[PDB]
Structures are given as structure tokens and as C-alpha cells.
């Protein structure tokens, strides 16, 4: 019906500023250290 010259345009529904736009194509119209290895009792203990 609406198809024009081999083009299948059929599958279409047919029934501030106020600009006007064209329809169908819109455009303007833990762990804490332990004592060892912490450097005491490694220089100490006079007993």
C-alpha cells in the first residue's frame, strides 16, 4: 500500500522554548612483635 517503487516502507504505524520537530524524522521544522629478633635479649642478660 505505502510501498513506493520497490521500497518496503509498509511496516510503519498508520492511524523554555517550544520548538517544532517533524514527525517520522525528528528535525526542527593482626600480629604484634614478640621479644626475639627485636634487638633485646641479644645485647643483655647479665645472668
Amino acid at each position: 500500500x505505502x510501498x513506493x517503487x520497490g521500497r518496503x516502507x509498509x511496516x510503519x504505524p498508520x492511524x523554555x522554548x517550544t520548538x517544532x520537530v517533524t514527525x517520522l524524522x525528528x528535525x526542527x521544522x593482626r600480629x604484634y612483635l614478640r621479644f626475639h629478633x627485636x634487638x633485646y635479649x641479644x645485647x643483655x642478660x647479665x645472668x
Partner: protein, 49 residues
């Protein structure tokens, strides 16, 4: 020239139905190009109304 086309596509396809949120997903789907560039352009467009 391609910038103008990106922008026109987005704005026109939004104005076809102004109460439907235009998402960057459809822009990414239809238009070829870097996705983050389209993302930034979409965000800029949303900024200026």
C-alpha cells in the same frame, strides 16, 4: 563532520519521542566508533539540557 553526525543522530532520535530516556547503549549499538567518546558526548548533551 563525523562529530556533527553523532550529535545529530542522538538528538534527532531522542526528539522522535521526548519522554523516553535515550541510553548510550542504543548509541553504541547503531553508530560505529569508540564507546567512551560516545559516552562523553552523551553526557555533554545531557548536561546542556
Amino acid at each position: 563532520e563525523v562529530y556533527m553526525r553523532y550529535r545529530n543522530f542522538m538528538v534527532n532520535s531522542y526528539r522522535l519521542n521526548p519522554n523516553e530516556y535515550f541510553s548510550v547503549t542504543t548509541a553504541r549499538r547503531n553508530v560505529s566508533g569508540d564507546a567512551a567518546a560516545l559516552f562523553r558526548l552523551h553526557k555533554f548533551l545531557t548536561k546542556w539540557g
